[PDB]
Enzyme design. Structure first.
Site, short mmCIF file in Angstrom:
data_model
loop_
_atom_site.label_atom_id
_atom_site.label_comp_id
_atom_site.label_asym_id
_atom_site.label_seq_id
_atom_site.Cartn_x
_atom_site.Cartn_y
_atom_site.Cartn_z
N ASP A 1 0.67 -1.23 0.46
CA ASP A 1 0.29 -0.05 -0.09
C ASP A 1 0.56 1.26 0.07
O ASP A 1 1.34 2.14 1.40
CB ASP A 1 -0.93 -0.10 1.34
CG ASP A 1 -2.06 1.00 1.21
OD1 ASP A 1 -1.65 2.32 0.27
OD2 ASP A 1 -2.91 1.22 2.46
N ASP B 1 -1.37 5.62 -5.55
CA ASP B 1 -1.67 4.97 -4.41
C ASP B 1 -2.05 3.20 -4.54
O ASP B 1 -3.02 3.53 -5.20
CB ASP B 1 -2.91 4.98 -3.99
CG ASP B 1 -2.99 4.60 -2.72
OD1 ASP B 1 -2.39 3.68 -1.84
OD2 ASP B 1 -4.25 4.81 -1.83
#
Length: 371
Positions: free
Chosen positions: A38, A222
């Protein structure tokens, strides 16, 4: 560093819209766990207590090298929430650099809507900067620790392949993962991986908005987010433009909202009717930019031939999620406070079209949001 990172190639797996993950070991002796990659957060956290959607979890009591920080932590995500206890332990990455580091670890003991049923991942590796670490910025994020404790260079790269697998190259740049050349955009501020978009195009046609609209209040890269997410204003314009370009077929108003699928007999998806999307990003030289272009094969995600429209609205700025990344080899060159983009050698496409990274373009003027 550059070269061939043959042990790290193909070290990621995913479950299609459920995230990409890498295998890591923690504790003594080593406990094995699948960890979600992440880039949109900064905590290393792992389930550390039974939960219906966990096949396995971290057992602190079996680690000789475990240490309790006598401090609790909670995180809310754009999606779900978890709470836990901070500590440290030894961490390795089997299909990564051959090192072992002591890192901070949140032991997740409670959660709601965080662990995805059947995702096969048990934790999360936040690869962003300490500024957005919970409880605060004094909790050193994992990658920081890895760089300070070893000679792994301050840099990692990601090739996510849709269809899920991919490659997390830690400490280097693997040339077999991309074709053409790498274009860099400055990282605006080390918190999230903030970048600046300066122009948007649908099939070559400019959306024509003040470029401030595109980065309000931030634009980020992201890998923990599936979609391309755009500010409401940019989103509305874009969907209008994309509807215009694919008019030869009409779709339920709720397809454009993510609320409905769309289907075609196997192997007949009319890819060509769908436009390509292009984000111009600020380059490293003054008044230069470059362009990344993605295909419908990127913003139309397959779903157990069926597809979900993977562009959506956001009130927290532009999130260049997995839809964007799966077109490209993305280099998070932290040593140099820049992010590189090159055409992925694995990105999904038809014979008539391919993702692209072209530049340079002369661009005048200012696009970043100020507080």
């Amino acid at each position: 560093r550059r070269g061939s990172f043959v042990e790290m190639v193909d070290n990621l797996r995913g479950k299609s819209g459920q995230g990409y993950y890498v295998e890591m070991t923690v504790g003594s002796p080593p406990q094995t766990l699948n960890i979600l990659v992440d880039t949109g957060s900064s905590n290393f956290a792992v389930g550390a207590a039974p939960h219906p959607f966990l096949h396995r979890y971290y057992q602190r009591q079996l680690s000789s090298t475990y240490r309790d920080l006598r401090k609790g932590v909670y995180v809310p995500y754009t999606q779900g929430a978890w709470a836990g206890e901070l500590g440290t332990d030894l961490v390795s990455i089997p299909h990564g650099p051959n090192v072992t580091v002591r890192a901070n670890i949140a032991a997740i003991t409670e959660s709601d809507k965080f662990f995805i049923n059947g995702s096969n991942w048990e934790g999360i590796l936040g690869l962003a900067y300490a500024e957005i670490a919970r409880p605060d910025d004094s909790l050193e994020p994992f990658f920081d620790s890895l760089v300070k404790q070893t000679h792994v260079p301050n840099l990692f790269s990601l090739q996510l392949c849709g269809a899920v697998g991919g490659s997390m190259i830690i400490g280097g740049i693997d040339h077999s993962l991309y074709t053409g050349s790498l274009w860099y955009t400055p990282i605006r501020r080390e918190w999230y991986y903030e970048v600046i978009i300066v122009r948007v195009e649908i099939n070559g046609q400019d959306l024509k908005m003040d470029c401030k609209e595109y980065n309000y209040d931030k634009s980020i890269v992201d890998s923990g987010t599936t979609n391309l997410r755009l500010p409401k204003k940019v989103f509305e314009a874009a969907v209008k433009s994309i509807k215009a370009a694919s008019s030869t077929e009409k779709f339920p108003d709720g397809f454009w909202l993510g609320e409905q699928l769309v289907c075609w007999q196997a192997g007949t998806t009319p890819w060509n009717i769908f436009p390509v999307i292009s984000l111009y990003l600020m380059g490293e030289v003054t008044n230069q930019s470059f362009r990344i272009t993605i295909l419908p094969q990127q913003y139309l995600r397959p779903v157990e031939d069926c597809y979900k429209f993977a562009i959506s609205q956001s009130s927290t700025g532009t999130v260049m999620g997995a839809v964007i990344m799966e077109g490209f080899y993305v280099v998070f060159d932290r040593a140099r406070k820049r992010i590189g983009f090159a055409v992925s050698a694995c990105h999904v496409h038809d014979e008539f079209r391919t993702a692209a990274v072209e530049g340079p373009f002369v661009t005048l003027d200012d696009c970043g949001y100020n507080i």
